[PDB]
């Protein structure tokens, strides 16, 4: 049902309201999403003004319903199979040495237009850490995914860790634990255990003068035990 809503390029508004250790703030991102080809183009603005954290930080935050699901694990694909109705999607993010995000999002068409509305909390960041302190580096690494089945939810979970890159050459963990659960009351797709292969750039816009980040994304699943190489044999 949801996932032919996906066969196409999809415009994509993002709206995340913001609060880390009392310093509130807002993000708007437009862009489009192609599952297709796994690929996401997306650019944010602050819309209060300089961001109180950096970049980096937000990118788990500000839709994964773009990501490729090959055909023999289009059965797997949770994300699309809630749409259009959506999910919830929470997680908690936990940076090692320093404070925490809680974020909730409500991610659904409106129109024939894919939103994801963000609310963001941190709390207990050291004020010189390295995300007060804005010392990670504008860049990201490559992530895998792990998702697993929450059927008491009617949803799935997800764990992995985010490695951010520290200007002196250090890395700066951020342990991902997020939670999706339908909005819909109709039926979805409960996946084996898989992951998602995630790719991320980050650039700007040579005409911009707000503070914002040009993000081109690639996230593709994986890790389902397939017996297709024996066809070409
Ligand atoms: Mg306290």
Not at 86 to 115: M, P
């Amino acid at each position: 049902k949801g996932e032919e809503l996906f066969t196409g390029v999809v415009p994509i508004l993002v709206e995340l309201d913001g609060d880390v250790n009392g310093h509130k703030f807002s993000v708007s991102g437009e862009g489009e999403g192609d599952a297709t080809y796994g690929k996401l183009t997306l650019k944010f603005i602050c819309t209060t003004g300089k961001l109180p954290v950096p970049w980096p930080t937000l990118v788990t935050t500000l839709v994964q319903c773009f990501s490729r699901y090959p055909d023999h694990m289009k059965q797997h694909d949770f994300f699309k199979s809630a749409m259009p109705e959506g999910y919830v999607q929470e997680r908690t993010i936990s940076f090692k040495d320093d404070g925490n995000y809680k974020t909730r999002a409500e991610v659904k068409f409106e129109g024939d237009t894919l939103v994801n509305r963000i609310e963001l909390k941190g709390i207990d960041f050291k004020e010189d850490g390295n995300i007060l302190g804005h010392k990670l580096e504008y860049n990201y690494n490559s992530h895998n995914v792990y998702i697993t089945a929450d059927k008491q939810k009617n949803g799935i979970k997800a764990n992995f860790k985010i490695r951010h890159n520290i200007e002196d050459g250090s890395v700066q963990l951020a342990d991902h634990y997020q939670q999706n659960t339908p909005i819909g009351d109709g039926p979805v797709l409960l996946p084996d255990n898989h992951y998602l292969s995630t790719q991320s750039a980050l650039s700007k816009d040579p005409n911009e003068k707000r503070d914002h980040m040009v993000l081109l994304e690639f996230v593709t699943a994986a890790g389902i035990t397939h017996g297709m190489d024996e066809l070409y044999k």
